[PDB]
């Protein structure tokens, strides 16, 4: 049954009254003080941002008036005796009306009003941080009573006072002896007395607001001691600062091997810089020091992964003034602009690596040898076909049709290949000597088609997952053999019948091949790539057999000896085939742990040499 | 640069005034509707929670006076052409005064006053969700006009109207014929018309508000059809209830091989359930903690806290509590102190439970250990505290030489029968039982009357070196202890020994003799065998052997070694091949070969000439 009661019988007949939305202050203050910020160390960051905004406002006003610029700086005082923290700046300052309209009203900020009266919003709107208006009340989260002493920068403004305990009541009075600017006095709570020490304050200042645009003083000394090189032009920063900055963000002692200075403004504002370490990636390498900034203050998201996961081996910093933020000044989760930011960064980073090989191929070879693991991971974990192909341009392989010791790409491979050819062949082997001596490649010697050699691990899996490059099918050499379209015939036929009976449980069928010269036998299976992966995966973990085919080579010297061995030592003949069968399995790559074949090997040896 | 402008010259001189804090409603509404919630689909959950709170208030009012209990229902309606969504409720209802006090004021909730004026906080304080007072204002985030009809259930209340354009100004009127309860009419935004589709709303409801304590309906039919079993006592839930509950949570139609119903209050109020799938794990299980946190019967959607450790990701269930502090965005305060202690308590509770399951049923635990054995091994290598290592080591089932084939034993029961004054435990690695028994290393320690453990699973040699201790006992591998511990004619032996230094000097640095072997012609002993095995696979014979120090020991009583003497001078060419085969065989037996594909060629040409005389 459809238990529905919705109707449209509601009737409106009276005269509608008009009211205005109200607001309750005590609950809002409690919410801000208790259940808004996860950490308790953000109030100093908010105060520093406010001081920077005030200093910027004063500088802009003086520039507009064209007067003499005085000294402007921010001072932090840490007094551990009374258990108090004090911050003082030299900004514009606020009069009684401004104090009442700003410090006494929730969700009200004068910075937005000032920006609305700029008529350009480009000269100073890129440096104002405050946008909500509830950042000051984070002081009550660690304080019980607050004192504010402010005097405006106007020639004739008097000092004032601002007393409040954070309980919905505040008072204002006129003061004397107050200098130009503002001075915030904070009385620390009982459980929050850790913030009255210099070490913790210095740590938080260095973590959050290290790159403030104005001098910052704590008990006399200055903490910034560094420039934000991601906001400066590339023509104004030297090569020496590019290394010192890298050693700071990466927390290392080496030099970077690459340096990208990206700066774009058309799709969205990006001011970023990236580095690649000289040293080889370690085990721990398998936010990745890509900390996100906004108006030169740390955001500390570390979870949204603004950079792709496979690109976790690079360091640097990213700045953007258009990213949306929570009320707690934290990054929004999976915003529309955030997804677009990740795509833009990935496209530029891949393009940068392509030009590096085009400029200096020798340097790129060393980079690919060390960091090549990360590129293979990206293709496997990708979900869009165009993403896989774009990343695949960075792969390097060496082919049989070229001298040993040089690497080729999948792009130029499609250029020198014949127009009649349409698919790409690849053979996997531990080395190149084994690859050319591999029995699978020996059958391909008849055709002149060019093949690529894959040596490193996961190359076979990476090629299988890609499955297509530039509309060209990727097919392995092993799969193309089963699909491909001395020992007279009479004496040959009975020899297989003696193997089918013995190896019936292992060798499902045996057929005579004519394309082998060196290896006595081969093992062929349809899904060779999957078999070489599934078998290695099962021994890798007990998670959620097959039918192999063996082909003998009549022209082989050992196979010729099998005719005269059965009629003389039938016992020795059985062990010999059990050794040839496992030898073929090892060459194919379907070999299990080889500890079990030692017993059959030593026993065969001690009986096969008792003739000398 | 010690120059500080900080001083204390400033002081108060004039009279002090007095002022009251104010607020800006428009900016507050903009913040709530634009920069508060990450995802735009939370308004349905908020309004459903409000309806549930109203129904709870009505239920308390109707049970307090001891009167009959009418029907409580939630009705969701959708209209594609109109682009409107309707959620009608039959709760207490609100008159003009409650409407203007609660709806018309930001951060004002009547539930908190109702909760505090309860005087008992026993039956209703645990089922009230709203505590902030800004939940209703999330409707403006998706709607261009909000229209609400409501009337109280009091004997004499009348219907009313409520309109708001989202511009900070609302309006109230009087209405007749309004059904008792609350009815919310929402007109959707132009770009937010995707919420007028039945499938998307069904997804939102089945994601956020599955376990509401009242029957809810969507377009006529019921969407709940399932009760929350973790709230009741374990005696009130049956096996068939568990199967359906495990089916929904884990999306698996099989039977849960394990079931735990944790209920603790001394550290903090916890009401959680757990499950273990019967099927075998796959990559989707291994690939990334599959447990959804709950609080007062509503989804919280943590997705980042990971309340359970990484190695315990193979279990499924839900976790509920009422003492978790969540911020204004209805999400947990990240890295909170109270959150950290929940992870450790839950981990150790499950550690004890798995120990218990072994006692009452060893066969069931043994089958369970084989299926998920990677997860316990994974936790040991990823743990930092030594105390936790012992808690996990009790869950490992190994096999020793004191029992026949196919009887697994634990470390604790292994260490209860070992020697008196020596703190040593012996473990050996082999793919099978036959290989372990015939391993040359085991044959070397057969002299002593000591017990040795045979572990057959992979990555187990790495676990025993990371654990490093078990109740103050040193873990020593069989291969390592051989080095630590301190026929053929002599003349023919030493000259035979001297040849290998001449022909294997590049690959062998020292050759010795062992008399304790009688079934293997070769043996390789290394100082740190366990470390070499795991470090070799992650990272041709010359540079490999340089970092392994492959000491070679040859049994002189083996028949193969004896025949090498009479083949020394008859054909030196074949002798160069057989000695290499012995060297290669020893490495294969020792398991220190990265890939045996290179040794096939040398072996293949040996057989073609070994029996050519036949
Ligand atoms: N040190 C200061 N000097 C001058 N004005 C200040 C100072 N600190 C705060 N204000 C004023 O306080 C008002 C709002 O304070 P605040 O709480 O910081 O909001 P906001 O910083 O503008 N926005 P946000 O910090 O992002 O929440 C504005 O009018 C500021 O000009
Ligand atoms: N449908 C409703 N029926 C009855 N009372 C309601 C209804 N919706 C809202 N109210 C009342 O109006 C108040 C304001 O709504 P709301 O913003 O959800 O507050 P809250 O839910 O208690 N706290 P929060 O968790 O932020 O939603 C509620 O606390 C209720 O007292
Ligand atoms: K303010
Ligand atoms: K409200
Ligand atoms: Mg600010
Ligand atoms: Mg609510």
Swiss-Prot record, chain B:
Annotated keywords: Acetylation, ATP-binding, Chaperone, Membrane, Mitochondrion, Mitochondrion inner membrane, Nucleotide-binding, Phosphoprotein, Transit peptide
Matching entries from CDD domains are given as: HATPase_Hsp90-like
Task: Cite the GO molecular-function annotations of the record.
Answer: ATP binding; ATP hydrolysis activity; ATP-dependent protein folding chaperone; protein kinase binding; RNA binding; tumor necrosis factor receptor binding; unfolded protein binding
Chief localization class?
mitochondrion
Q: Name one GO cellular component term.
A: mitochondrion
**InterPro entries assigned to the protein according to its UniProt record, in alphabetical order:** HATPase_C_sf, HSP90_C, Hsp90_fam, Hsp90_N, Ribosomal_Su5_D2-typ_SF
Q: Which residues carry this modification: N6-acetyllysine?
A: 193, 255, 263, 352, 359, 394
Task performed by this protein: Chaperone that expresses an ATPase activity. Involved in maintaining mitochondrial function and polarization, downstream of PINK1 and mitochondrial complex I. Is a negative regulator of mitochondrial respiration able to modulate the balance between oxidative phosphorylation and aerobic glycolysis. The impact of TRAP1 on mitochondrial respiration is probably mediated by modulation of mitochondrial SRC and inhibition of SDHA.
**Assembly and binders:** Binds to the intracellular domain of tumor necrosis factor type 1 receptor. Binds to RB1. Interacts with SRC. Interacts with SDHA.
Q: What name appears for this protein in its UniProt entry?
A: Heat shock protein 75 kDa, mitochondrial
User: What species is this protein from?
Assistant: Homo sapiens (Human)
